[PDB]
Amino acid sequence: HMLTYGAPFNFPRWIDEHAHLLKPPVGNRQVWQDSDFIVTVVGGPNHRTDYHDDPLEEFFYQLRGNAYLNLWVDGRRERADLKEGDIFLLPPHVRHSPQRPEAGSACLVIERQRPAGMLDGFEWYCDACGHLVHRVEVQLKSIVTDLPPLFESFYASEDKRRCPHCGQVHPGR
Amino acid sequence: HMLTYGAPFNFPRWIDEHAHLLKPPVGNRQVWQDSDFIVTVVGGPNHRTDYHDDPLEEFFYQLRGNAYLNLWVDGRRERADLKEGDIFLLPPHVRHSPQRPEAGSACLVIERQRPAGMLDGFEWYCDACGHLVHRVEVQLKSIVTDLPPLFESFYASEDKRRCPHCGQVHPGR
Numbered sequence: 001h002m003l004t005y006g007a008p009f010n011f012p013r014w015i016d017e018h019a020h021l022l023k024p025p026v027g028n029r030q031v032w033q034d035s036d037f038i039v040t041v042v043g044g045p046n047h048r049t050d051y052h053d054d055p056l057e058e059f060f061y062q063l064r065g066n067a068y069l070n071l072w073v074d075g076r077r078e079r080a081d082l083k084e085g086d087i088f089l090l091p092p093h094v095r096h097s098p099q100r101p102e103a104g105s106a107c108l109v110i111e112r113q114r115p116a117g118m119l120d121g122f123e124w125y126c127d128a129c130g131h132l133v134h135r136v137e138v139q140l141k142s143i144v145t146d147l148p149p150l151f152e153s154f155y156a157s158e159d160k161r162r163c164p165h166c167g168q169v170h171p172g173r
Numbered sequence: 174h175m176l177t178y179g180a181p182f183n184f185p186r187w188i189d190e191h192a193h194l195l196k197p198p199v200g201n202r203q204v205w206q207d208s209d210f211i212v213t214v215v216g217g218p219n220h221r222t223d224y225h226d227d228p229l230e231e232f233f234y235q236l237r238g239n240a241y242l243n244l245w246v247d248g249r250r251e252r253a254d255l256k257e258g259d260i261f262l263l264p265p266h267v268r269h270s271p272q273r274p275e276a277g278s279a280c281l282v283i284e285r286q287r288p289a290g291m292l293d294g295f296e297w298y299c300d301a302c303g304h305l306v307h308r309v310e311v312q313l314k315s316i317v318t319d320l321p322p323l324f325e326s327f328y329a330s331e332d333k334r335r336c337p338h339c340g341q342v343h344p345g346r
């Protein structure tokens with residue numbers, strides 16, 4: 001039938017035109033609305049203390065500049081570098097915290113709409129004892145707008161940030 | 174848990190190392206195996222007379238060189254140009270025939286594994302009366318290997334290529 005999502009267009013030029021809109025905490029912009037593939041560009045600098053626990057995979061292609069992913073691989077606080085030109089496929093549920101410090105950076109991130117009842121988690125870990133401080137689960141509907149309200153609630157509440165092993169109150173900063 | 178799909182790596186350099194393997198009819202190479210996102214690069218020159226009827230969306234990013242998509246939009250034999258640097262999201266079921274004439278071209282194509290019972294179609298249309306000549310449906314398991322055997326069967330059989338409106342026998346060439 002129709003091309004619902006429009007005609008091909010130049011991506012470098014699209015990124016240039018929307019550069020001034022790539023803004024924190026999360027830094028992104030969705031290219032097409034109501035699609036099954038969720039196609040965003042993420043710039044910087046961003047502010048993220050959360051780990052994301054995505055029930056599906058996440059494709060990355062660091063188009064401009066560099067960034068890294070803080071991970072928890074196999075229990076250990078780990079890092080994956082998104083050097084300019086790198087690509088990478090995250091397995092479902094690997095906890096990850098995108099750090100994007102470079103102004104003018106641009107990373108293509110691709111995900112899919114989540115079916116009903118498949119939940120996304122956002123977690124924070126204690127920077128002293130390294131144990132789970134807080135975890136919210138959300139039925140995700142916008143990878144752009146549903147994020148910061150969630151982090152504000154954590155940021156605004158030392159009961160959420162108080163650790164349950166040590167009593168260290170996470171800075172959320 | 175583990176990074177099942179490995180660590181980030183440089184995509185331009187990966188494409189360079191596998192250039193000599195991007196070979197017709199279809200021209201592709203999957204970057205990761207057993208993933209839900211099916212991430213391929215497609216080079217050229219390719220030989221495609223089929224239209225693909227994908228039950229899911231297809232993301233394109235023409236990385237090197239140019240290509241086009243022959244389409245059937247709203248009944249009309251149409252074209253979408255994949256100019257170097259273009260991106261594009263195909264809606265599910267839009268019939269499309271990727272033409273990739275340029276040696277050394279490279280296009281990122283992203284799709285997802287198809288659930289059980291969601292079928293892919295490959296169709297051919299009559300180049301005289303413009304009506305459907307032949308359509309096979311397949312449970313797709315490899316976007317790389319399941320293709321040409323299907324086209325050989327059409328190519329090898331004038332009963333499949335004989336049109337049911339006119340009697341024009343499609344060249345399959």
Ligand SMILES: Nc1c(O)cccc1C(=O)O
Pocket residue numbers: 026028042052054058098109143
């Ligand atoms: N992985 C991300 C996500 O799931 C949402 C928003 C941004 C990112 C990112 O990688 O920057």
Ligand SMILES: Nc1c(O)cccc1C(=O)O
Pocket residue numbers: 199201215225227231271282316
């Ligand atoms: N759309 C394609 C597909 O579905 C399989 C293989 C190649 C392509 C292509 O766009 O070249």
Ligand SMILES: [Fe+2]
Pocket residue numbers: 052054058096
């Ligand atoms: Fe994420």
Ligand SMILES: [Fe+2]
Pocket residue numbers: 126127128129130131163164165166167168
């Ligand atoms: Fe702690």
Ligand SMILES: [Fe+2]
Pocket residue numbers: 225227231269
């Ligand atoms: Fe296709």
Ligand SMILES: [Fe+2]
Pocket residue numbers: 299300301302303304336337338339340341
């Ligand atoms: Fe015909």
